[PDB]
Design a protein around this ligand. Structure first.
Ligand SMILES: C[C@H](CCC(=O)NCCS(=O)(=O)O)[C@H]1CC[C@H]2[C@@H]3[C@H](O)C[C@@H]4C[C@H](O)CC[C@]4(C)[C@H]3C[C@H](O)[C@]12C
Ligand SMILES: C[C@H](CCC(=O)NCCS(=O)(=O)O)[C@H]1CC[C@H]2[C@@H]3[C@H](O)C[C@@H]4C[C@H](O)CC[C@]4(C)[C@H]3C[C@H](O)[C@]12C
Length: 1189
């Protein structure tokens, strides 16, 4: 519902929203209410000019000029005596100039209450809706998190509640003043004259449809432009990310064709954005100017003869129906903000109240002292609440006698993580209650249950604090003398001394965190500090480095002793010294014995061991765009004069109700309300042209500035893609958003700087030609009105709404308590993370009570400055009607041409992309285009034409990784070759040998120690002619968003694009029978949407992508890392076939790949020591000799 968004309001938060309600009803009557003054004020100007200029003729009775020449100082001689000083102008303008000055004060102080008492009174609810939501989201099960994301529960905390902030706070008071001004705008048009407002009201829904689709079409075309660019920004976001393989196959010159062709969709919603917002700006415009010629043409007849409308109330019923039909349609961009919020709060308001099964309640249970360490599982059966169509635990039965160890052993997945997880009560058994020393796991306090058990996880995860209270989370009572007791027994005390500081070393997450073998040593102290009676460690040393494996398993196996331990094993050589291994095969704990009762029986421990335990820059660049920017700047000089030519002409029709002969008010008033018809029906056209051409110039620019941008980003060094800051998740935001900022320094500045030069010139010239002594009063208020035109269209600096970067500290304390929810529930309490959010949630609240009276202020001073500009300048205008002798038509033409072009000179300076961020956004593309990287594909290709035959010979290759500071030395070595053999590097692990063959292409170059191709050097061997003859294969395979054949097709775009060699390399590369076992012949699309392949049998595409070429050197760099050796043997047949006449370098990490082939040189320092074939690894140690020793 919608009025259910107002729930979380205390009693002091419904009165703070009610004095803002009747100050938004009371501000919202002054916009048609001030027409009551201007109605009756242009009638006292015009009842004075009649008796002035009728006295300006010595005509009819000159012995008594009707009344005038002092016939009021007599006694009773005035039978018609109105033509005297009855109508004193100067004493009447003071009776009007203090009418505006009262509205100016009573709209400054109610335009401040209505928008300070709705941003305060609705940034006080969200501090309570973003707080109940996080308190009940932590009391869920663990099962509710298994079918919800982390990234979906983190846009429903900062991106979704920021939509029911926009519906409650700002757009509600600023709605109800746009609704009580379109009620009083029509009703104060009826009560004056009923028949003269009924004709205008028939076109009044046509002026309001057209002005409700300008506001509703700015914030609705950003749904399309994100959804019409990203059909093409998913092509150049999967080439920059997979950048190693587009280089080595040479598809640089053609990949930008598949991005240029996909790009015109952004070129089409850009041109149909400056038409719809362009044409409908004219269709409002024309319909105002054609409506002035309907209330002054047919409205003249009623005031010309009828007489039942003085000409004041002919411009007062008319200007109040117009201003009550703009404000009707203008309340539609905020009647969208109500329904965006209403539809998007159904997910928050559901999660606030669910009351699920297990939680943090301290009532319903039986707290039980003296647990004797009894664990019992009755006959259970279990289902995950994500994939419920399986019985994971199939009728389990196990007992755990207290005192000593207990194992739990499976083949590969039998009771991997679920069987150890029921006992600390994360999930519930649907049958078979499980019990601990009497009564079962339910009917107990969960706060009591989770204090005995202490778990050691698979992976170590640590919170962002320091190592003092990263241990103190378990059992908060314990002291600094007592933490170190567990910090030594877990063997971190020798890490306490050798540390840059003691007990405050902020290396939790925002510091330099250490290795997993010394992160696992922190969690043991968290589990020992609480004095537990149960232990549970589930593959503790699983994802870490095996050097640490020795010392951390000594702490579990030998140091820990004294009570129950239920510990599974990463490998069974550790769990041999056990009490009762209760391992199993499927679902039911079958063995229940030691290794000697299974010396005669099968089990899964006596089974498994036999197979495992055996600016001028822009305009010159926008060169072909001279026709559109010229027709767009002739059409921007005609609708820049329509703002000061209206004011020259409205005061013309407002003066010719003071021409004395009654017939002249039928043909002078008709030949001026005919110029409005030629002013609307032109500005319906030229407003369209000024919007069409400038959304075609700067659109066809920014389609072309992406094509030149994406080529000169593609063909460069590999050594700056892997630079630190411009990572491929943040380079394609420089090419999506940042390439449209340049549009505001060529195309659209011309439509502001010539739409202002023929605006604030023709307005001054009309102003200064008539009354230069009145034009200097109102021109003092001139800068303060361009602020009321730049705020009327509303993105003034004064919104202060880019304080999202104070919600990032809130957005990190909510992520490190929800992305690791396994280790918060099972360890200690989540009570601190429902006290470390609610502390932190003050700093965005204080910056939404400091914004609530700056946007509160500058909304009112940009609303009371026109009403005081007419107060100090109609006042002085009456000083000149009566004393200095000018006409009354020359006040309306001077006071209204510098304010009618003072609001339009600031309304057009907010509809233009700013210029500060467009003179530097085009200053980083113009350096990206004009950049000369030292190695690149686009070079004029020389230094070529050598018949290769793979004679690639190394001489002392010292290397650095000269971009990323990984080391200062990578291993220098020198290996020669003859064509047809192997280099076969095996040895060190970290960046020593694989760098040297990632060096092999034109990727990196040696600073020293130059290499040869055929006696040449790889600074004077070109990139294009070398790379035709290599063949690489990578570690992670990557296949593009195409079919099976098309990636096989992708191997060579250099030649005539082959079909003939796919058949010859189908049965060679061992895919000829898997390409026939498919749902379709070759159109199996495996990119992003179809059924995904296995990496173990995607390698067979990754090898086969190379061999469609005619390579002279292979680069078999680190394939075949599939963890199932059945599928490894399938591709191991495939690597053996890509040989017999081709140079190879195969690293062969798993040593069964080929051994007797050729030399083995690299080592830990990588020095060439063994230039020898495989028979020389007996007297000196080699690859196989180390693992057998
Ligand atoms: C009629 C309005 C003036 C009354 C007013 O001040 N309302 C309160 C201001 S708000 O609640 O804070 O927006 C103004 C404000 C916004 C104006 C519109 C917007 O500026 C959008 C375009 C701008 C074009 O230059 C003219 C047509 C137009 C479609 C404008 C017509 C008209 O002058 C509007 C509708
Ligand atoms: C007259 C209307 C209300 C403001 C006003 O001038 N009232 C005079 C009384 S007082 O001084 O406030 O006392 C305003 C509101 C919207 C305005 C119109 C819109 O801004 C659209 C265009 C804008 C062009 O610059 C001028 C013509 C015009 C068609 C405007 C004429 C006039 O200024 C309108 C109709």
């Amino acid at each position: 519902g919608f009025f259910q968004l107002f729930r979380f309001s205390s009693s002091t938060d419904i009165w703070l929203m009610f004095v803002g309600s009747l100050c938004a009803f009371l501000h919202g009557i002054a916009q048609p209410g001030v027409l009551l003054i201007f109605g009756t004020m242009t009638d006292v100007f015009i009842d004075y000019d009649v008796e002035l200029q009728e006295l300006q003729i010595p005509g009819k009775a000159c012995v008594n000029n009707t009344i005038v020449w002092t016939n009021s100082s007599l006694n009773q001689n005035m039978t018609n005596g109105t033509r005297c000083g009855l109508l004193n102008i100067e004493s009447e303008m003071i009776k009007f100039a203090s009418y505006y000055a009262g509205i100016a004060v009573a709209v400054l102080i109610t335009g401040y209450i209505q928008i300070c008492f709705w941003v305060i009174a609705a940034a006080r609810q969200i501090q309570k809706m973003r707080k109940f939501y996080f308190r009940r989201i932590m009391r869920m099960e663990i099962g509710w998190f298994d079918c919800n994301s982390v990234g979906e529960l983190n846009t429903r905390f900062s991106d979704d509640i920021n939509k029911i902030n926009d519906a409650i706070a700002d757009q509600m008071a600023l709605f109800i003043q746009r609704m009580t001004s379109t009620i009083c705008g029509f009703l104060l048009g009826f009560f004056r004259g009923w028949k003269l407002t009924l004709v205008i009201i028939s076109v009044s829904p046509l002026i309001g449809i057209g002005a409700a689709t300008i506001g509703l079409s700015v914030s609705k075309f950003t749904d399309y432009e994100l959804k019409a660019y990203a059909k093409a920004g998913v092509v150049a976001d999967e080439v920059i990310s997979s950048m190693r393989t587009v280089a080595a196959f040479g598809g640089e010159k053609r990949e930008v064709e598949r991005y240029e062709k996909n790009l015109v969709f952004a070129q089409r919603w850009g041109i149909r954005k400056g038409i719809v917002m362009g044409f409908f700006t004219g269709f409002v415009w024309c319909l105002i100017f054609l409506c002035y010629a309907l209330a002054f043409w047919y409205g003249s007849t009623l005031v010309l003869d009828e007489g039942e409308y003085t000409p004041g109330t002919l411009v007062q019923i008319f200007l109040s129906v117009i201003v009550g039909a703009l404000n009707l349609g203008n309340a539609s961009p905020c009647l969208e903000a109500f329904a965006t919020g209403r539809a998007a709060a159904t997910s928050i308001f559901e999660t606030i109240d669910r009351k699920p099964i297990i939680d943090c309640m301290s009532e319903d249970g039986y707290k039980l002292d003296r647990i004797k360490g009894e664990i019992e599982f009755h006959n259970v059966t279990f289902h995950y609440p994500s994939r419920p169509e399986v019985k994971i635990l199939n009728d389990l039965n196990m007992v755990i006698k207290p005192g000593e160890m207990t194992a739990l052993v499976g083949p590969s997945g039998a009771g991997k993580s679920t069987a150890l997880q029921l006992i600390q009560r994360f999930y519930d058994p649907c049958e078979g209650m499980v019990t601990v020393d009497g009564h079962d796991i339910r009917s107990l306090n969960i706060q009591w249950l989770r204090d005995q058990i202490g778990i050691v996880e698979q992976e170590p995860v640590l919170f962002s604090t320091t190592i003092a209270e990263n241990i103190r989370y378990g059992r908060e009572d314990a002291t600094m003398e007592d933490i170190v007791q567990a910090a030594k027994e877990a063997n971190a005390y020798n890490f306490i001394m050798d540390l840059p500081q003691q007990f405050d070393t902020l290396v939790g997450e925002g510091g330099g965190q250490m290795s997993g073998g010394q992160k696992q040593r922190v969690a043991i102290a968290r589990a020992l500090i609480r004095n537990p009676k149960i232990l549970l460690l589930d593959m503790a040393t699983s994802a870490l480095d095996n050097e640490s494996e020795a010392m951390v398993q000594e702490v579990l196996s030998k140091i820990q002793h004294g009570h129950t331990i239920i510990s599974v094993a990463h490998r069974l050589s550790t769990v041999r010294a056990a009490d009762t291994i209760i391992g199993f095969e499927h679902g039911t704990a079958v063995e229940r014995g030691t290794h000697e009762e299974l010396l005669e029986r099968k089990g899964v421990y006596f089974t498994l061991v036999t197979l495992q335990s055996q600016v001028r820059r822009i305009l010159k660049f926008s060169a072909p765009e001279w026709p559109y920017m010229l027709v767009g700047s002739v059409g921007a000089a005609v609708n820049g004069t329509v703002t000061p030519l209206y004011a020259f002409l409205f005061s013309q029709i407002l003066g010719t109700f003071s021409i004395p002969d009654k017939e002249e008010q039928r043909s002078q008033i008709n030949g001026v309300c005919l110029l409005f018809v030629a002013m609307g029906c032109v500005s319906l056209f030229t407003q369209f042209l000024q919007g069409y051409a400038f959304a075609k110039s700067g659109e066809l620019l920014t389609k072309r500035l992406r094509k030149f941008g994406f080529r000169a980003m593609l063909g460069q060094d590999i050594a700056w893609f892997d630079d630190l800051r411009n990572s491929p998740g943040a380079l394609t935001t420089r090419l999506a958003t940042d390439a449209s900022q340049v549009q505001g320094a060529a195309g659209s500045q011309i439509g502001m700087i010539v739409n202002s030069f023929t605006n604030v010139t023709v307005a001054m010239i009309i102003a200064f030609s008539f009354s230069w002594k009145l034009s200097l009063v109102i021109l003092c208020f001139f800068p303060f009105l361009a602020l009321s035109g730049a705020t009327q269209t509303r993105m003034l600096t004064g919104f202060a709404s880019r304080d999202k970067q104070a919600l990032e500290m809130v957005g990190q304390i909510t992520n490190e308590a929800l992305s690791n929810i396994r280790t918060v529930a099972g360890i200690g309490k989540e009570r601190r993370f429902i006290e470390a959010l609610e502390t932190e949630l003050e700093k965005p609240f204080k910056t939404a009570i400091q914004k609530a009276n700056i946007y509160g202020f500058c909304f009112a001073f940009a609303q009371c400055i026109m009403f005081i500009a007419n107060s100090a300048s109609y006042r002085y205008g009456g000083y000149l009607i009566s004393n200095e002798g000018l006409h009354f038509s020359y006040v309306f033409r001077v006071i209204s041409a510098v304010v009618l072009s003072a609001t339009a000179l600031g309304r057009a300076f907010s509809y233009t992309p700013s210029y500060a961020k467009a003179k530097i956004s085009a200053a980083r593309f113009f350096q990206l285009l004009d950049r000369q990287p030292p190695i690149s594909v686009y070079n004029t290709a020389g230094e070529k034409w050598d018949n290769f035959q793979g004679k690639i010979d190394f001489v002392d290759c010292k290397f650095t990784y000269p971009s990323r500071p990984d080391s200062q030395v990578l291993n220098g070595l020198s290996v020669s070759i003859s064509p047809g053999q192997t280099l076969a590097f095996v040895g060190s692990s970290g960046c020593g040998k694989s760098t040297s063959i990632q060096l092999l292409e034109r990727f990196y170059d040696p600073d020293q120690g130059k290499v040869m191709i055929d006696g040449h050097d790889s600074k004077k061997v070109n990139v294009q002619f070398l790379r035709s003859n290599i063949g690489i294969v990578s570690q992670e395979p990557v296949l593009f968003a195409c079919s099976i054949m098309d990636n096989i097709k992708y191997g060579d775009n250099t030649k005539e694009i082959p079909m003939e060699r796919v058949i010859a390399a189908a049965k060679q590369a061992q895919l000829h029978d898997f390409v026939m076992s498919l749902p379709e012949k070759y159109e199996t699309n495996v990119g992003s949407q179809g059924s995904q392949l296995s990496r173990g049998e995607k390698q067979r595409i990754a090898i086969a992508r190379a061999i469609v070429r005619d390579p002279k050197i292979l680069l078999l760099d680190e394939a075949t890392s599939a963890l199932d050796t059945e599928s490894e043997k399938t591709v191991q047949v495939a690597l053996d076939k890509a040989r017999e006449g081709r140079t190879c370098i195969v690293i062969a990490h798993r040593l069964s790949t080929i051994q007797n082939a050729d030399i083995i040189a690299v080592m830990a320092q990588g020095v060439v020591i063994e230039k020898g074939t495989h028979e020389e690894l007996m007297a000196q140690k080699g690859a196989y000799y180390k693992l057998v020793t």
